[PDB]
Amino acid sequence: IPELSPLVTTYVSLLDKCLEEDSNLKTCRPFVAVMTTLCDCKDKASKKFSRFGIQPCFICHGDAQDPVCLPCDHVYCLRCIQTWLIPGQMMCPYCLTDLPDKFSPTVSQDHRKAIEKHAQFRHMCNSFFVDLVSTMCFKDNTPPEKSVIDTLLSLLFVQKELLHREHTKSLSPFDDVVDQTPVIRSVLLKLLLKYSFHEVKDYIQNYLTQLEKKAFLTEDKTELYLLFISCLEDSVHQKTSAGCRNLEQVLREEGHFLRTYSPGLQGQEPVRIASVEYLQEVARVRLCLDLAADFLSELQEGSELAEDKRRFLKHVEEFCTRVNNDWHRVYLVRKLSSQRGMEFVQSFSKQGHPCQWVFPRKVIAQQKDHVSLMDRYLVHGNEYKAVRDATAKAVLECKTLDIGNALMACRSPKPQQTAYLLLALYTEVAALYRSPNGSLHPEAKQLEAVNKFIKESKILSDPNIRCFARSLVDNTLPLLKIRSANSILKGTVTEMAVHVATILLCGHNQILKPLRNLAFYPVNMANAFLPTMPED
Amino acid sequence: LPAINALISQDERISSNPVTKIIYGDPATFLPHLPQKSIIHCSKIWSCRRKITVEYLQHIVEQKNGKETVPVLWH
Ligand SMILES: [Zn+2]
Ligand SMILES: [Zn+2]
């Protein structure tokens, strides 16, 4: 927009002449000066743009779309003016002026262009304002003054004016902007938290009280608390990672903290009190539990923990058996599962491993040793489940018609139907074989049932499907014998293999033809252009 | 992913295991030795979150059309 260069060069000179005497942006005076400079620069820019400062709609407090020009030179939303001027209030709410005829005169050449220019200018101003407050106020490790922190925190509010009240702005030093939803950002919180936690407790506590008193009186404060905990834990993570420190000193620091953790669970508990000290404490214990989860994963993968990390794990176990807040144990087990998987905690849910202390008391008392694996094939949904349940029922009994009846009572024709049938067969045989109690169940006069079903049902009597079925039913298929050693990814790799084999067999698509050639005709792929390889 | 996670969590041969409840999407209120309901002790708060890694940044930059918006970070 080549229509603001002279004014902004004048403002460049103005900010230069007011910057020599205070070349320290960390205090309040230059922040206030530059805020006023940006504000009156926006005002003068709008004045030069669109005939002395076009204002937002008075009702929604935001920019007006499809502008309608009142005789008193007022810009209101077309929706707001159409839903507000229809009853017996034919008068401009701002200056109290009666509109003669109707909201008919609209301008399609002037107001919209000025509005878009104002939006662009305000976007750049706000963006580099938050850029400066992130940079100029945070050049070094020295915390800024209290006054500038107070000003930047109070800038967010749109407090009571003549008429919703008490919104929250995205660091905009201007007033012609609103969000008609109280939303709390974390950029100011994060910027405050980059400093040491000891020197910013008052500011974050004041902001918390302000948002609890005017933004989140009675609402879902759980999201707010988890957001603040995440921000605090990210801040301490950055402080630990960026700083020049080893692992043994932080290990002993965390061990001492856990040993010196006074419970204090009754202080900020009941309904409303959430001290920033308690948020720091919960973030710290969550980080400690994440470290313990990593140590347990390493112990499962490898040898002992060099007698030092074992001390940290012992302190964690003493903490868990000392405090009754099992929510921390739930967080620890969730982190362990997210790091490795469910089979990790299933192996840890055995009957005497020296890690049962990481599990609650009721989770081990009534857990049997028949804890199996789940079928990860539920991606289909509502139809693979039915056919697999019918297949399991046919496995339990000798009748084999239930699976066919369920198959013929569904949509998703022959390709995906055969995929479902073969996958259910594989899942049933794998579940029977892996479980030692029911080993070789189809061979107990039940393989004749499935064989008669294959001979009777022509929905899968394809020679390739027939050979796959006969290989899979008697466990002669060369995928089960992967002879892995980790005993964790053996089943996963085998099930990837069997699922891709079933997909290729049942995928009768042109793109799947080369994949079929690779997975079933290797002799023809002798000296062939194998994909996903580097080229010069 | 949430839909398949919820459906798999409801499978009626692993849900019998109490371990998968405190793991695969069931609030831990069913554990008797628990503190009372608290605004800070919500089930969502005590859940697990991700660890931001540059490969996740790669996913964000490729999935949000970083070819022309922010290509320098992409490279
Ligand atoms: Zn007016
Ligand atoms: Zn409006």
Structure description:
The structure is cut from a larger assembly and holds two copies of chain A. Chain A contains 21 helices and two strands. Chain A is an all-alpha fold and 536 residues long. The A-B interface holds A 221-223, 225-226, 229-230, 265, 268-272, 274, 278, 282, 324-328, 330-331, 333-335, 337-338, 342, 345-346, 349, 359-363, 366-367, 371-376, 378-379, 381 and B 4, 7-8, 11, 13-14, 17-20, 22-24, 28, 30-35, 38-42, 44-49. Bound molecules: zinc ion (2 copies). One zinc ion binds at residues 57, 59-60, 64, 77, 80 of chain A. Residues 57, 59-60, 64, 77, 80 of chain A line the site of one zinc ion. Chain A: Zn(2+) 1 binds at residues 57, 60, 77, 80. Chain A: A zinc finger (RING-type) spans 57-96. Chain A: Monomer. Interacts with UBE2L3/UBCH7; UBE2L3/UBCH7 is the most efficient ubiquitin-conjugating enzyme E2 for the ubiquitin ligase activity. Interacts with UBE2N/UBC13; promoting 'Lys-63'-linked ubiquitination of target proteins. Chain A: This is E3 ubiquitin-protein ligase RNF213.
